[PDB]
UniProtKB/Swiss-Prot annotation:
The chain holds residues 1 to 406 of 692 of the full protein. Interacts with LIG4; the interaction is direct. Interacts with ATM. Interacts with BRCA1. Interacts with PRKDC. Interacts with TP53BP1. Also exhibits ATM- and phosphorylation-dependent interaction with the MRN complex, composed of MRE11, RAD50, and NBN. Its EC number is 3.1.-.-. Belongs to the DNA repair metallo-beta-lactamase (DRMBL) family. Keywords: Adaptive immunity, Disease variant, DNA damage, DNA recombination, DNA repair, Endonuclease, Exonuclease, Hydrolase, Immunity, Magnesium, Nuclease, Nucleus, Phosphoprotein, SCID. The modification Phosphothreonine is found at T380. It is an enzyme of class 3 (hydrolase). Phosphorylation on undefined residues by PRKDC may stimulate endonucleolytic activity on 5' and 3' hairpins and overhangs. PRKDC must remain present, even after phosphorylation, for efficient hairpin opening. Also phosphorylated by ATM in response to ionizing radiation (IR) and by ATR in response to ultraviolet (UV) radiation. This is Protein artemis.
DNA sequence: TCAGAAGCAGTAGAGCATGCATATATGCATGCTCTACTGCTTCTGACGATATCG
DNA sequence: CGATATCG
């Protein structure tokens, strides 16, 4: 999910990954990647009506994001309003107002996120300092020190705020394995399965639309088989991905999707209508790459687990784990840090108190001096009546006199 | 006698929300409201012929 | 034929 309101505190004139209610007054739109939770309001009728009444508002995103977005027929009205920006290329954006001729320049830099085709970061630099928006990123430990654009002369830049992805910001997802390990496990399993007979097929229950192209491409390169998907016209301008997918159902590896694909697999049938070739039945096994299932285990588990006679689960996460998030935020050391999404189990307060010790808040101060005036006793209640005998005791000490005047 | 006027019920067309599981992406499906418009049913009253009285 | 009151 995306708990972001698509509006930074430093630059409220730009909205990122959210165009629902208050972002209709923004001067520039930014899109991290092409996931549905980061595209709320992008197809709204009010936004459609606003686009046809303005000329200076644009939608900035990665070129791969533009290719994936313009392929959908529902978003083709953005064809003349999308401006793609290369990664690691500092460009100047003009936040010109429509009504008044006022203008404001800001410098944005796109950084790779390693999440899905077209996923990038947004690094803004303007009058209110430097802010960073890492929407659904994935960085291993020790990789934050390798980003060239986040360093200024060998040291980390002065970052004011970080709107980081906190999908797995909880002690349950302590150290998620790298995607290479899950890839190797899935490759070994699929090889050992399909190497027996040409009728052994492997399903890949991939929930997200984008993010699993790495697995498909590497399985195709290591097995020579082409994965089956529903639609592949979206990758028509991406040769390195298009030549690994196929619409034909006569392939072994499959990654097709369907709302009722579970019952179909239970009936020994892929999501595609084909259930057998040449009237010879097919032997199907299901591999579901996910991460939330592994975050609920109670003992030592493996990357490739077997939950049934023809069912498997793989730990394939496109989100940074708790340790990776902590390492990234501690290396950046920003003034503030806001969670974009709250975990299902965790709440807002726990994520906030986890992220706070990592922020650059190393500034303490002694409490303000509370004055003490007008003492709480006016009259001397401890006064004596001065009745004595004056003979049992020695003479009183005479009052001293001091005439020195410096 | 009957034209015309209320009064009420149904729908098109747009728009929006939520429910979906151990997924953080679902997009996808589904089901609801709103508003203007049309049609049917019930009601009313003026009206003209024609009955009746002079 | 008046023209008044029905009655549909
Ligand atoms: Mg997303
Ligand atoms: Mg994402
Ligand atoms: Zn298929």
């Amino acid at each position: 999910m995306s708990s972001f309101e698509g509006q930074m505190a430093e630059y409220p004139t730009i909205s990122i990954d959210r165009f629902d209610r208050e972002n209709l007054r923004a001067r520039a739109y930014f899109l991290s990647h092409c996931h549905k939770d980061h595209m709320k309001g992008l197809r709204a009728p009010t936004l459609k009506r606003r686009l046809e009444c303005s000329l200076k508002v644009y939608l900035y995103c990665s070129p791969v994001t533009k290719e994936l977005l313009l392929t959908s027929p529902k978003y083709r009205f953005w064809k003349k309003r999308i401006i793609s920006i290369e990664i690691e290329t500092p460009t100047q954006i003009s936040l010109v107002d429509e009504a008044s001729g006022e203008k404001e320049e800001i410098v944005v830099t796109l950084l790779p996120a390693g999440h899905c085709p077209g996923s990038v970061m947004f690094l803004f630099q303007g009058n209110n300092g430097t802010v960073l928006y890492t929407g659904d990123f994935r960085l291993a430990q020790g990789e934050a020190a390798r980003m060239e654009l986040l360093h200024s002369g060998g040291r980390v830049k002065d970052i004011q705020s970080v709107y980081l992805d906190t999908t797995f910001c909880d002690p349950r997802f302590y150290q998620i394995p790298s995607r290479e390990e899950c890839l190797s496990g899935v490759l070994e399993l699929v090889r050992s399965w399909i190497t027996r007979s040409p009728y052994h097929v492997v399903w890949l229950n991939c929930k997200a639309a984008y993010g699993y192209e790495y697995l498909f491409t590497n399985l195709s390169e290591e097995l020579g088989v082409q994965v089956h998907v529903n639609k592949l016209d979206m990758f028509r301008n991406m040769p390195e991905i298009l030549h690994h997918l196929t619409t034909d159902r006569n392939t072994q590896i499959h990654a097709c999707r369907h709302p009722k694909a579970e019952e179909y697999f239970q009936w020994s049938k892929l999501p595609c209508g084909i259930t057998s070739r040449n009237r010879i039945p097919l032997h199907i096994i299901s591999i579901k790459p996910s991460t939330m299932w592994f975050g609920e285990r109670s003992r030592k588990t493996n990357v490739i687990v077997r939950t049934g006679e023809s069912s498997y689960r793989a730990c394939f996460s496109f989100h940074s784990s708790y340790s990776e998030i902590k390492d990234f935020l501690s290396y950046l050391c920003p003034v503030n840090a806001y969670p974009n999404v709250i975990p299902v189990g965790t709440t807002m307060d726990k994520v906030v108190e986890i992220l706070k010790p990592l922020c650059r808040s190393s500034q303490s101060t002694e409490p303000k001096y509370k004055p003490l005036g007008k003492l709480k006793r006016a009259r001397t209640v401890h006064r004596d009546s001065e009745e004595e005998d004056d003979y049992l005791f020695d003479d009183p000490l005479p009052i001293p006199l001091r005439h020195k005047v410096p």
